[PDB]
Amino acid sequence: TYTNPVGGITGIGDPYVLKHESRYYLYATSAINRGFKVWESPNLVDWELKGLALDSYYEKNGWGTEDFWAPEVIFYNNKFYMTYSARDNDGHLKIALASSKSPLGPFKNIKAPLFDRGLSFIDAHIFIDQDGTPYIYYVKDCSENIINGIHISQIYVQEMSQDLLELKGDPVLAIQPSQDWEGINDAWQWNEGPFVIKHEGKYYMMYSANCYASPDYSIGYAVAETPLGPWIKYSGNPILSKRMDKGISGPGHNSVTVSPDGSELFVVYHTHTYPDSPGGDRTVNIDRLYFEDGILKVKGPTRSPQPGPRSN
Ligand code: NA
């Protein structure tokens, strides 16, 4: 069995898991002044810290001053590509692209920043469709995005070039705060942390809304017929939300992976380490993710013993 939070990993946020060759690699917001830690597991339950996968102080890097957030790693063209964001010398948060021959690094910058529009961007997520076309989903961050008086984080999407170095065409708005559960009467509003999966020919974008430092941080999804949208939010959002009666606060900024035997999906998400006084100290959790009647569902959030991720 497992009991959340799995691995006892605290002082993090934004857990991204990649499965590769029967091992799992977790990358997270961690060393915020410097880079990103990686943890390894054979089973999604037992985790071992394996150092900085991306270190801005590594001799081949050097980019970014602070605010190293939300790394994601894909295996594409027979190597590993990491996206992340950090604050540049000009004060704007920007997305960067790095690569490595190994999931444990060292990752080396290949285009840092990946793009630059004089504004703040975070939470890049690269989705490779079944036909091999890459798409990047990313956040135009509330810090520098004010629309009709609201500081608002919006998720955009663009198709990428095959080499991942260019974002094609104009940015396409995917989603922005719009549903009642997303704090649409607040001065600051968020849709962030996109993660896209495909199921039965449709595309499902999981995302987080409300403030990361509130118990009300929570996960919803939207559905599209094509990766560039239109993206239509699930009416029953959020699909993963707090259970303060279980000490579960602010479930958010998730990734998705599969069990060791390939038979079932898990959502990997953070919650506040200290629900009595929430903030940036978050911890890693997993729970079962599945589709039923065309609805994406989570069995959770749990904090009691659950059957281990299915394995042979
Ligand atoms: Na992410």
Numbering used by the authors: 4 to 315
What does the paper say about this structure?
Based on primary and tertiary structure, the H. orenii glycosidase is a member of family 43 of inverting glycoside hydrolases, with accession No. cl14647 and sequence cluster cd08772 (superfamily GH43_62_32_68) in the Conserved Domains Database (CDD). The conserved catalytic nucleophile is placed on blade 4 (Glu195), the catalytic base (Asp17) on blade 1 and Asp126 on blade 3. The enzyme displays activity with pNP-αAraf as a substrate, but no detectable activity on pNP-αXyl or pNP-βXyl, which suggests that it is an α-1,5-l-arabinofuranosidase and not an α- or β-xylosidase.
The deposited model includes riding H atoms, and the asymmetric unit contains two protein molecules (molecule A, residues 4–315; molecule B, residues 3–315), three HEPES molecules (one associated with molecule A and two with molecule B), one sodium ion per protein molecule and 1032 water molecules. On one side of the −1 subsite, Trp72 (blade 2) forms a conserved sugar-binding platform. In the present structure, the piperazine ring of the HEPES buffer molecule is wedged between Trp72 and Tyr215 in subsite −1, but does not form a planar stacking interaction with the aromatic rings. The metal ion present in the structure is represented by a 20σ peak in the σA-weighted difference Fourier map with coordination to five ligands: Glu75 O∊2 (2.1 Å) and four water O atoms. The metal-binding site in the H. orenii GH43 glycosidase is strategically positioned at the propeller axis to provide stabilizing interactions between blade 2 (Glu75) and blade 5 (His256) across the axis, which probably explains the increase in melting temperature in the presence of divalent cations.
